[PDB]
Amino acid sequence: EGMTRKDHGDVSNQLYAKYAIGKDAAAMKAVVGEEALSIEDKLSLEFLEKFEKTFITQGAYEDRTVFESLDQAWSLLRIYPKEMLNRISPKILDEFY
Amino acid sequence: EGMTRKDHGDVSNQLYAKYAIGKDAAAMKAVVGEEALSIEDKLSLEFLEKFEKTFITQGAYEDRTVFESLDQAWSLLRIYPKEMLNRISPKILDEFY
Amino acid sequence: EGMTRKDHGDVSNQLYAKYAIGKDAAAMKAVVGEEALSIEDKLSLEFLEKFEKTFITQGAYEDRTVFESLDQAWSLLRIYPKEMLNRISPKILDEFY
Amino acid sequence: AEKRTLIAVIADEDTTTGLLLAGIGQITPETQEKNFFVYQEGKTTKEEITDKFNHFTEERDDIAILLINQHIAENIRARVDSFTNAFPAILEIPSKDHPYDPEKDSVLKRVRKLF
Amino acid sequence: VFPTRMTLGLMKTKLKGANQGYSLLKRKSEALTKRFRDITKRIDDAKQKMGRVMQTAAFSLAEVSYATGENIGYQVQESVSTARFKVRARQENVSGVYLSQFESYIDPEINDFRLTGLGRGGQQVQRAKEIYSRAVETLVELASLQTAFIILDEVIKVTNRRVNAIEHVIIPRTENTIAYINSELDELDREEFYRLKKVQEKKQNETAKL
Amino acid sequence: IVAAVSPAGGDFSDPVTTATLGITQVFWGLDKKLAQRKHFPSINTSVSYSKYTNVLNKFYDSNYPEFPVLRDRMKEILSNAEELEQVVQLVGKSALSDSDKITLDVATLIKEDFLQQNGYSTYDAFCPIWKTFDMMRAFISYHDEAQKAVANGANWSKLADSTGDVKHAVSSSKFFEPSRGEKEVHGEFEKLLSTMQERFAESTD
Amino acid sequence: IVAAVSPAGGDFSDPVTTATLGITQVFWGLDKKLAQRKHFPSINTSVSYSKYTNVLNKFYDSNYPEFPVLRDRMKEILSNAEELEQVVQLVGKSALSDSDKITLDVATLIKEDFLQQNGYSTYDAFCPIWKTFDMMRAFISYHDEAQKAVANGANWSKLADSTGDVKHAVSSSKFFEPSRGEKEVHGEFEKLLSTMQERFAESTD
Amino acid sequence: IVAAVSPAGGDFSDPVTTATLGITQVFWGLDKKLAQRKHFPSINTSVSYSKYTNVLNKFYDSNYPEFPVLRDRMKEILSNAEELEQVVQLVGKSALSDSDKITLDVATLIKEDFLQQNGYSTYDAFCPIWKTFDMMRAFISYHDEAQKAVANGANWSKLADSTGDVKHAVSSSKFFEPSRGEKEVHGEFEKLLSTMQERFAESTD
């Protein structure tokens, strides 16, 4: 703390877990098709697409700050209800989704 | 004879063949779907479950006589009528069905 | 060229192509039937059969010259019209068909 | 094979009666219930159509083709779309006093995505 | 996990299975999709056809009702309790799938009622009834394609799932397995030789030495 | 020399099996899975060849048997069966034509009667070569009729009902003995060829 | 002795894992697929055993828990879940009962809530025997009640939607310390049983 | 150094090939189907890459060519074309419209003009840096203006028939002399730009 959030690690756990789920949901989209998919997969499908072109796309002479990355994470991660966001504690979660 | 039946060889043959088909059908259910399956295959799926949970399930201290074990084998075999069983010589079949 | 005609290289393109399409088309016949089978593939289904049973089936001491071999080739392709042998020059095809 | 013989209707009065002159639906004599439902536009409730649809698809196991006026299918839209079976076949036809719109037809909606 | 020695013969044939499956079911799909497109176009046209002819007959009946006096159509609906046009269903194999089809039979149970005769007003209902029977019978025959069309609609979704399912999950799983066990298998044959050769060199050296 | 083999190297292309299959002249298959399920001695039709077949069959040909002609058609039925087997697994049974169903159906008859071998010597497990030709003659005479019916119009299902009695007999061929018809072939098999023809004429019409 | 090892061949087929496994009495696997979803320590029923389990569960039974029965069921629910999942992936979920979804659904809650326990606090890192009992008890109870609910009338979607917040209430129990309630059993888990029963009536309705 | 490699042990994942792809900066594939069609080298846009491209496009841009902008667009068109065909199979033509239809058509003209060669002419085997620049300039100019024209109201078939003479003349630029506007400079391309503007008026109206 004082350079990182303690939430920094916690935020990472949402980002990694959702990415995976999303990646699985895209695998089912390819096979079954959207109509077949349930509501949970659709959200996750959406998360995956946003993750690729915004998070992991940045410039090559472009710096980032750790604070700044987490604020970008919160918006992108914000595509799920509180039931589904549960890889971070209700205190930190209530503030920021 | 006198401690085991003459049907004994025949009885083993029947269990393998159905148990084998049942297994093969369960795999096709998984990939392609139930468009591949047929009515005969339903008997077989049903036969796998009856075999596993009755024949193979027993005690660690629950001993049996050989005559009982052949009597229970028969019980499972009752679900296919005589005309779909052909792993026994028909002569023997009429006695014990 | 002098003891083999010029048509050998051209004819080989057509026989190879049809033969390929022909393997696939037979598998398709089995499923679809002949009530919804494609026309191009219907001629190729019959083509697979003749290619085996006369161009590949021969006697023990049956000997055939190269000129002869070439003629048989055209006979199998003769069933298809020109519009399904489009990978060959109209001059050569008009002579050899 | 044969298990369905009747052609049923959900339509406005002039449409239904005419279909009956042509000789396609009937009333069962043992239940005292029609295998057609008359409807008049703006005048008869959205709810009754929804029941009658259930009577025809799921309680009648003898209706071969359920014909339905486009304007009318549009009132109970969920009910027509959600039924994806061919048993009965659902045949949406342009309603009297309206032209042919291809998207008031449940089977065509489904057709557009995945050929 | 995966077998230590020789999954490769099996995995070879698994690889073959997968691959044939994808080709054939894509052909089956290809035939269903090709037929479906054609049927979709027939249907769009036919809907307009049915609507126009049905309505012309609708308008003729409506005028008739008004002129005769009273709402005739309530009377007709009760009185009618049998049907002329019924269908007997038959199975037709189109594109390896079994569909339900309908064939109309016209029963002569009813042909005139007790409301198509009234005297003068009755002659009007009669002229109307005849336009409706001719128009409707055509509509019943066109409706037959619908039943099959809906079953086609269902089957294309299933069949598409399968071509994509063999493609993504099965084939690359089969690639990953076959490679890992091939490399292990080869490693056994080569290391075996290397251990034996390394020991031989020693045994040979000793004998030369003593 | 009849020589048994088995793997011994943990491989399916093992040094014992490979070098022996080269020097051998008759190769008749056998699958472990079928043998356990009851079909011993088992045989794999696509993993077999015999170089001596050509002269030997011609020997059986001269003595009475029509033998060469039958042998080629038995393998053929079984070849198509493998191709069919993959479609049957995947798509299902609901797509195959009338001809294809038969191929599987006559294949069943051969699998039942030849591949299975009931007893040491009980159930007449001993078949002489002439009896074997007669067992085969009954199935392929049935196949050609069966192929003609569907082609001349007759549903697979309809054709199966109508065949009935002659089909049960050919199914029952293995319990019978040739020592009570002639001495090496059965009078019962000779009678079977007449019955086939008669059945066929009724059933087609 | 509790001893970690690893692969050396990128498998569990390598000499190292297999030899140490030969000797062992407790086996706790490794699942790369679960690890991605953020689960640690990641195990599965199919890759783990303890030969001590029988005697151990009886011991745990004495202290208060329903532990023997729940462990039998714990295995079954995850093993049935795996087989079903293969058909959903390949074929679809639309060719499969609402009921088969239910097994997967309850199973998922167990997957996040148990498996991930790597903790971000001592409260999410510690789980006494009583607390471990409690979270398992509420999930099995949910399953049993849910299958009834849908069966007498109630769609899938409606059931999923309704239980909603309750699914979460168990999810969050790990984050909260076990020194709370009566002892080491939360008042939140105690209430959770009543909330469950109150929920089945509404879902059913 | 351009080195050829084939499969060695029949696996193209073996150490030899795999070691060399890591070192390489340039890859240009070979495919049996593409080779039969007379496209040599038999490349598309994913069986091939160059990481030398960056420095190289910079080098050529200096010489006079508008090269970097045009090359990127070449890659994009091939990638898209492939992708719209898959949609036509699974989704259908409902996701197809004329804007997409022009995209397929530009890629076809690019394949024929660039990818296909075999040395039919002497001018089909040496084409300067400036000539290559000029071919890609016609096709991208056709693309953008065809799309504009169908948006102000036109159809694919109508665009195709109308472009016609120019479309034919630019495909045939490889058979045509590269000394037409001097010695490296081709005059036909310089006269294409103006024709294209008058043409766009014919296609729209």
Q: Kindly state whether E161 is in contact with chain B, defined as any CB-CB distance less than 8 angstroms.
A: yes
Q: What is the Rg, in whole angstroms, of the alpha carbon atoms belonging to chain F?
A: 19
CA distance D49 to D73: 9
Kindly identify which residue of chain B lies nearest to residue G84, measuring between CA atoms.
B30
d(CA G36, nearest CA chain A) in Å: 6
**Mutation for E interface: G6, G12, G13, most E CBs within 10 A:** G13
> Do G152 and G204 contact (CB within 8 A), yes or no?
yes
Give the pairing of strands F26-27 and E97-106: unpaired
Record: contact C32-F97, CB cut-off 8 A? no
> Which residue in chain H is spatially nearest to E176 when comparing CA positions?
H13
Assign G26 to helix, strand or coil.
strand
Taking the domains of chain E in order of start, what are their residue ranges? 5-207
Domain positions in chain D are 1-115
Q: CA dihedral defined by D18, D19, D21, D26, rounded to 10 degrees?
A: -130
Distance from CA of F95 to the nearest CA of C (A): 5
Chain E CB contacts of A32 under 8 Å are: 161, 164
Taking the C-alpha atoms of residue F190 and residue F104, their distance in angstroms, rounded to an integer, is 26
D114: left (phi over 0), alpha (psi -120 to 50) or beta: left
**Distance, C-alpha A24 to centroid of its chain:** 14
The β-bridge partners of G181 are G185
Question: How far is C38 from C40, CA to CA, in rounded Å?
Answer: 6
Distance CA G56, CA G65 (A): 12
Gap between the Cα atoms of E95 and E159, Å rounded: 12
Q: Do residues C33 and F95 touch, judged by C-beta distance below 8 A? A: yes
Least Cα distance to D63 among D1, D6, D2, D24 occurs for D6
Distance from the E184 Cα atom to the nearest Cα atom in chain B, whole angstroms? 28
Interatomic CA distance for residues B21 and B14, integer angstroms: 11
Residues of G in contact with E4 (CB under 8 A): 13
Give H17 to chain E, closest Cα distance, Å: 15
Q: Is C86 helix (H, G, I), strand (E, B) or coil?
A: coil
Q: What class, spelled out in words, does domain D1-115 have in CATH? A: alpha beta
**Are residues G37 and A32, on separate chains, in Cβ contact within 8 Å?**
no
Q: How far apart are CA G185 and CA A93, in angstroms?
A: 25
Which amino acid makes up residue A53?
K
User: What is the distance of C-alpha C19 from the center of its chain?
Assistant: 7
Which experimental method was this entry solved with?
A: cryo-EM
Of the partner residues H11, H13, H90, the one whose CB lies closest to the CB of residue E160? H90
* Measured distance CA(F155)–CA(G121) in Å, rounded: 73
Rounded to 5, what percent of chain H is helix, strand, coil? Answer: 60, 5, 35
Rounded Cα distance, B58 and G67, in Å: 23
**DSSP SS3 for F63:** helix
Rounded CA gap, G197 and G190, in Å?
12
Distance CA E57, CA E76 (A): 16
Contact flag H90-E179 (C-beta cutoff 8 Å): no
Neighbours of chain D (3+ CB pairs under 8 A): E, H
Chain C residue numbers with beta carbons less than 8 Å from the beta carbon of F87 are 27, 30-31
* Contact call for residues B22 and B48 (beta carbons, < 8 A): yes
**Whether F92 contacts chain B with CB within 8 A:** yes
How far, in Å, CA of H111 to CA of H139, rounded? 11
What resolution, expressed in A, was reported for this entry? Answer: 8.3
Contact with chain H for residue D113, Cβ under 8 A: yes
Nearest residue, CB atoms, E93 vs list C24, C27, C33 = C33
Report chain F residues whose CB lies below 8 A from the CB of E6: 10-12
CA distances from B31 to A26, B35, F36, F95 (A): 18, 11, 27, 18
Q: Is G122 on the interface with A (CB under 8 A)?
A: no
Q: What is the CA radius of gyration of chain G?
A: 19
Chains B and G touch (3+ CB pairs under 8 A): yes
Please give, rounded to a whole number of angstroms, the shortest distance from the CA of D41 to a CA of chain H: 34
CA distance A97 to A77: 7
Measure the CA–CA gap between E103 and E145, rounded to whole angstroms: 11
Measure the CA–CA gap between G120 and A91, rounded to whole angstroms. 13
DSSP D34: B
Q: Which residues contact G174 (CB under 8 A, 6 or more apart)?
A: G113, G117, G123, G124, G127, G135
> Distance from C69 to chain F by nearest Cα, in Å?
27
* Distance from C-alpha of D70 to C-alpha of E51, rounded to nearest angstrom: 10
| Distance in angstroms (rounded) separating the CA atoms of residues A10 and B7 | 67
The token pair at C17 is 């192509």
Q: What share of chain F is helix, strand, coil (3-state, %, to 5)?
A: 60, 0, 35
Q: Where are the beta strands (DSSP E) in chain E?
A: 85-94, 97-106
Q: CB count, 10 Å around CB of G172?
A: 15
Greatest CA span in chain G, whole angstroms?
57
Query: Cβ(G71)–Cβ(G57) under 8 Å?
Result: yes
Task: State the first-to-last Cα distance of chain G, in angstroms, to the nearest integer.
Answer: 53
**How far is it, in rounded angstroms, from Cα H123 to Cα E127?**
80
Provide the b/e sequence for G97-112 (b: ≥16 CB within 10 Å).
ebebbbbbbbbebbbb
- As given in the structure block, the two tokens for residue F47 are 């993993």
Give the C-alpha separation, H145 to C77, whole Å. Answer: 45
Whether E150 and chain A come into contact, CB under 8 Å, resolves to no
Provide, as residue numbers in chain E, all residues whose Cβ is less than 8 Å from the Cβ of A27. 168-169
Q: Residue G125 CB: number of other CB atoms within 10 A? A: 11
CATH architecture of E5-207: Orthogonal Bundle (1.10)
Which amino acid does the sequence have at A52? E
**F116 CB neighbour count, 10 Å cutoff:** 20
By 3-state DSSP, what share of chain C in percent is helix, strand and coil, each rounded to 5?
Answer: 65, 0, 35
Which residues on G lie below 8 Å from B30 (Cβ)? 86-87, 90-91
Residues with Cβ within 8 Å of E128's Cβ and at least 6 positions away in sequence, in order, are D18, D21, E57, E60, E61, E64
Q: How many CB atoms lie within 10 A of CB A1?
A: 7
DSSP-derived secondary structure for H2-63:
------SSS-SSSHHHHHHHHH-SEEE---HHHHHTTBSS---SSSEEESTHHHHHHHHHHH
Which chain E residues are closer than 8 Å to F86 by Cβ? Answer: 17, 20-21
The separation between the first and the last C-alpha atoms of chain E, rounded to the nearest angstrom, is 49
Alpha-carbon span F162 to F202, nearest angstrom? 9
B5: closest CA of chain F, how far (Å)? 15
Amino acid (1-letter code) at residue F193: L
Alpha carbon of residue F141 to chain centroid: 12
Say if residue G49 is exposed, middle or buried (CB neighbours under 10 Å; 0-12, 13-18, 19+): middle
Burial H41-54 (b: 16+ CB within 10 A, else e): ebbeeeeebeeeee
Does residue F77 contact residue F105 with C-beta atoms inside 8 Å? no
